[PDB]
């Protein structure tokens, strides 16, 4: 039938893509960066143990000033943290206590939360009322919200349980772009430093490079064996990292759209919940299910440290904009600042 | 510390005290998980214990604040949002006992009860529900008895369904669901034949929740 002919054409196109990637695979990052000086062991000590949450911390996000910090938990609380003095700036009680993601707006006036309620709720952090009031409930997704990042004060990008990512308008509650190209549950989305091409990973073991001005699956990234849980853009917007429950995390570039490096260890059999990059992109911190966060050398797939000191799984993790500190969160209701 | 720094510290202490009060209030409240295969009895059960995503419920029986999250409308991969309901005291698994003589009307090869059997097996043997008891409700007992009077149970279960009597058929099915609990020591499956007009299912949930609360208190103390 004609369905078989179209399937054959699709298979031929996939073969062409694979052949192009193989032809462009002249060398490997591991070979190219073997002569560089090893980074050495980076032992980090907890400087601030942010206590106060009373459930599993599902997500955190740093602010733009590298001091303010936002966290979410099953208790139903979004807490703004003054990481310098451990002072809780705000305590926002969520509508639904099933949050899986949170976001701090770059301007610093908005925080967004969402989860199993399928709504991305935006909270106004700066008001003459002297409190945090929900400003907009961005609804229309048919699946749980798993990652949401602000573009500006009036634009957010939302990756939901269903295969659909969304670009939203904060003011007018309509969805600007549909971002419909996945075949599974999409968990983690990243955002380029220039905010014109955001990458996202799903449960089809595939990561998608999306174009945000128009709406287009620019590139597709395969190689994982199970669902991609975490994603993070490189400091320069031409590479990104992915984490899956196959106990591996990989480096996917964009101008060659191939896997560059795979960061795996034999003793690691648990999955990865959160991944993040440091400034200069030498360190790839990843939060595993074996209760400790791991520091990987991005240029050389080799161990560089372990952020041990979390009782339960490391759910959320993030580096500051100035790179001064690493803030690591886990399911044991504790946020730790490593420096 | 400057005056503003001390005032910020005081604000943080107030926020901490509010968070502690809220956590204490929530710790004295019971989390239930309404999650079953068939949605026909789902609505009836949720409505009678009440009187686009996760729906909520809040009913107080005998000075016990209950919340029961019905998650049947998620229609997504369950392996990624079910670790959220790890602190749930009990999962109210409601299944249709009238699926006998029915073939799920969709697959036409596997019974609706047969599929719900694997759904239960997966839930009861899930990693996050190792110590979570399951309150099993077998709804549509009236339809089940009229169908068993119409025809014997052998059609749904050719492997020794038992006898044509409704009591024997229901007992055999209840055992065939109970024995799926491999961890027959940590948890305990609470089965209950509930009538459509019956109103004691809320009391049954309360009794099961009190028993599970006692069990968890026993584990929390050294007597376990």
């Amino acid at each position: 039938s004609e369905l078989d002919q179209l399937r054959q054409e699709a298979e031929q196109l996939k073969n062409q893509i694979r052949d192009a990637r193989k032809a462009c695979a002249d060398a490997t990052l591991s070979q190219i960066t073997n002569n560089i000086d090893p980074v050495g062991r980076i032992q980090m000590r907890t400087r601030r143990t942010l206590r106060g949450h009373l459930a599993k911390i599902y997500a955190m996000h740093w602010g733009t000033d590298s001091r303010l910090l936002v966290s979410a938990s099953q208790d139903g609380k979004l807490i703004i943290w003054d990481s310098y003095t451990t002072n809780k700036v705000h305590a926002i009680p969520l509508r639904s206590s099933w949050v899986m993601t949170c976001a701090y707006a770059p301007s610093g006036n908005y925080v967004a939360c969402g989860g199993l309620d399928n709504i991305c709720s935006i909270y106004n952090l700066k008001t003459r009322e002297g409190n945090v009031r929900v400003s907009r409930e961005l609804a229309g997704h048919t699946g749980y919200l798993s990652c949401c990042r602000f573009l500006d004060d009036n634009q957010i990008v939302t990756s939901s349980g269903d295969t659909t990512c969304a670009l939203w308008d904060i003011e007018t509650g309509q969805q600007t772009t549909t971002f419909t190209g996945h075949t599974g549950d999409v968990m983690s989305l990243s955002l380029a430093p220039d905010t014109r091409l955001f990458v996202s990973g799903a449960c089809d073991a595939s990561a998608k490079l999306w174009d945000v001005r128009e709406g287009m699956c620019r590139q597709t990234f395969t190689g994982h064996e199970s669902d991609i849980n975490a994603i993070c853009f490189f400091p320069n917007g031409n590479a990104f990292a992915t984490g899956s429950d196959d106990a591996t995390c990989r480096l996917f570039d964009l101008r060659a759209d191939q896997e560059l490096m795979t960061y795996s260890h034999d003793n690691i059999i648990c999955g990865i919940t959160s991944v993040s990059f440091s400034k200069s992109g030498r360190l790839l911190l990843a939060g595993y299910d074996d209760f400790n966060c791991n520091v990987w050398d991005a240029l050389k797939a080799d161990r560089a440290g372990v952020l041990a000191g979390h009782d339960n799984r490391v759910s959320c993790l993030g580096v500051t904009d100035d790179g001064m500190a690493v803030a690591t969160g886990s399911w044991d209701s504790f946020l730790k600042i490593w420096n | 510390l400057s005056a503003e720094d001390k005032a910020a510290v005081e604000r943080s202490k107030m926020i901490d005290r509010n968070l502690r009060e809220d956590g204490e209030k929530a710790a004295r409240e019971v989390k239930l998980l309404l999650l079953g295969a068939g949605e026909s009895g789902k609505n009836t059960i949720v409505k009678q214990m009440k009187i686009t995503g996760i729906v909520e419920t809040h009913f107080t029986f005998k000075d016990l604040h209950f919340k029961m999250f019905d998650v049947g409308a998620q229609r997504s991969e369950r392996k990624k949002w079910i670790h959220c309901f790890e602190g749930v005291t009990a999962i109210i698994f409601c299944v249709a006992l009238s699926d006998y003589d029915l073939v799920l009307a969709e697959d036409e090869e596997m019974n609706r009860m047969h599929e719900s059997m694997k759904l239960f097996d997966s839930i009861c043997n899930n990693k996050w529900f190792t110590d979570t008891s399951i309150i099993l409700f077998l709804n549509k007992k009236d339809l089940f008895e009229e169908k068993i009077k119409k025809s014997p149970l052998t059609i749904c279960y050719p492997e020794y369904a038992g006898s044509n009597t409704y009591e024997e058929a229901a007992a055999y099915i209840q055992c065939q669901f109970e024995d799926l609990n491999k961890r027959k020591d940590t948890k305990e499956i609470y089965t209950h034949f509930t009538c459509s007009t019956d109103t004691k299912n809320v009391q049954f949930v309360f009794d099961a929740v009190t028993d599970v609360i006692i069990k968890n208190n026993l584990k929390d103390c050294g007597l376990f």
Partner: single-chain antibody
Amino acid sequence: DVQLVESGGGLVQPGGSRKLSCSASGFAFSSFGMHWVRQAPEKGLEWVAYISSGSGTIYYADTVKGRFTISRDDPKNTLFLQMTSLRSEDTAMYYCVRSIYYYGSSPFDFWGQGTTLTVSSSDIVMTQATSSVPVTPGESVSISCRSSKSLLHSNGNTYLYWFLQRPGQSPQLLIYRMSNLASGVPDRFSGSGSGTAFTLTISRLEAEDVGVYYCMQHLEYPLTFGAGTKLELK
């Protein structure tokens, strides 16, 4: 939306006792630290008391003492101020102030219209030696201020506040904590300044820029004001 109305006042017998009430609306009263600020009939402002959110810290001034008592009723959003003996120096234009304190807060954000009280017949000193300056439209004028102690704390910020008192109007916050602009204030009111002597910038002076400019330090709780700088439109 935010409104603060003062009640109680007028004429008092010597050694009298009257309570001043301030009912709030339009904002979260329980999350704001209430203040009381007096103003002599012809001289500048002066801080009176301060009650924090949650009634934790109750700090009074030195001129006023146990006679002056500040109370907060989170419910009903009422701020109170009672006195037990009214000396002749207590005749003043009392003002209420909302103050909220977190990392990037804007303390002394809002004020009130005030109430009239008339009688019947160490601390950092803010000098502001400049008294009157003739100002022309569009002319960029500068207002000076000097304290008796360095206001830059170890937290990397200084605790000098700037206020503008238009003729017949309640004081309004212009810049808080060394040139951070307030809410609803034209950007022409720039700040700039460092050390222990601090300057101001108005840039394109307009008709609304007329009035008297007041200083205040928030480093030590005595919270001393300074004599203002009237800007005569000439």
